[PDB]
């Protein structure tokens, strides 16, 4: 952006993209995962269905939270971020920081753990790998930054 827009952005810490570095901001992503396992198990189905449901819902929720909405949910200066998602605002646009690394690693380990159960079905295995790769890591790369289709 131009000089005035950058000054407005830099004049105040972004309250909508700063909590991710605070205390407990890492263990929460692991804790929300253990609850999905105990809930989909409470549904009472076969292990593979529970695991695939867990993985799918986590990935979809993470995407709809960090990638779909643009801007700040309140007034910043004149908005100053009217066309940036929450993921792009992490660490004032600095890529491959420890936080970004952790949020990249999480889905891969999720798939590694879940694979052992639904591995014997081709359709579930293909769907899970497709959704993981295409709705996880891909928007989080450094090449898709500020890329609108």
């Amino acid at each position: 952006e131009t000089f005035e827009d950058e000054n407005d952005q830099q004049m105040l810490p972004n309250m909508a993209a700063t909590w991710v570095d605070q205390r407990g901001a890492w263990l929460i992503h692991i804790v929300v995962i253990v609850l999905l396992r105990l809930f989909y198990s409470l549904f009472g189905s076969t292990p593979k269905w529970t695991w695939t449901l867990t993985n799918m819902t986590y990935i979809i929720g993470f995407y709809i939270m960090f990638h779909l909405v643009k801007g700040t949910p309140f007034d910043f200066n004149g908005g100053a971020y009217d066309n940036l998602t929450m993921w792009e605002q992490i660490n004032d646009e600095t890529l491959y920081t420890p936080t970004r690394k952790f949020l990249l690693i999480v889905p891969i380990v999720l798939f590694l753990i879940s694979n052992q159960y639904y591995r014997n079905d081709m359709t579930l295995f293909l769907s899970n790998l497709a959704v993981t790769v295409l709705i996880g890591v891909v928007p989080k790369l450094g090449i898709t930054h500020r890329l609108r289709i």
Partner: peptide, 14 residues
């Protein structure tokens, strides 16, 4: 094809 996928995932995670 399973262990191939897992090994590729380990490479990319590193």
């Amino acid at each position: 094809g399973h262990f191939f996928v897992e090994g590729l995932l380990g490479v990319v995670i590193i």
